[PDB]
Each structure stands twice: as C-alpha cells, then as structure tokens.
Design a protein around this nucleic acid. Structure first.
Length: 74
RNA sequence: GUGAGCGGCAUCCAAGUUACGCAUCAGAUUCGAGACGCGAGUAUUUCCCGCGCGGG
C-alpha cells in the first residue's frame, strides 16, 4: 500500500505498479550495495566503498559491512 | 522484518480612534365651450343591376 518511511502518518501511498520484462542492455540489477570483492565487470558505473548491509534489514547496524555502494544512487 | 519502527507547530493577542453632502437656482411663456341635421319639390315610367319579385 505504501512506499518509503513514515508510513504511519500516511506517506507514500501507491497508486499502481507494473512489472515488465526488459532487455539486460537497458540497465542492470547491480545498482545496489555490492559485496566488497564484487566483480568489476558486473558493476554499472562508479562504486564507492562504504559501510552498508547487504541483506534486509538494512537499518540493522550490527549487520553493516564494508560494501560497494553506487555513487550515482546514494 | 520498505536506514524501517516511534513522534500535535502548539499555546497567547480589539483594526481602533477622529470627520456636516454642503452651498446657489420662478414650471415659466400663448390660445372663445361655441359651433353643427333637412318642411329643398308631381303622378306613374327610361335606359338596366340581380334571374313572377328584390332595385339607380
């Protein structure tokens, strides 16, 4: 029903959604927090080393790890 | 377990005081209730309008 934080006060209601099959050339799934030793070939753009979780929950500070985070997305 | 989860912009406050729509300006100049209804013309048929009868 809602996207993002502050859902309790009604922020980010979903009007609709769509899932579409697209060619890989359009964009990749790598625009996320990658492992430290992730292969360079699969990375899209510049990745800056930072501390982040690789699995949900990403807010758990005990699960944080040195990870590659895309600079063009943070 | 959507860097998620949880969280009052809320409380209080005078638009009010004072201020002349007023001073001046002809509804005036002309003209009749006094005039208007027939005592107007001969005798018996003539061209005609509707068709014995209505009628120039």
């Amino acid at each position: 029903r809602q996207i993002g934080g502050r859902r309790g006060v009604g922020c980010g209601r979903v009007a609709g959604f769509s899932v579409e099959v697209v060619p890989e050339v359009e964009c990749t799934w790598a625009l996320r927090a990658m492992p430290d030793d992730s292969e360079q070939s699969i990375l899209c753009g510049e990745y800056a080393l930072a501390m982040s979780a690789l699995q949900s929950p990403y807010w758990d500070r005990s699960l944080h790890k040195p990870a590659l985070v895309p600079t063009s997305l943070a």
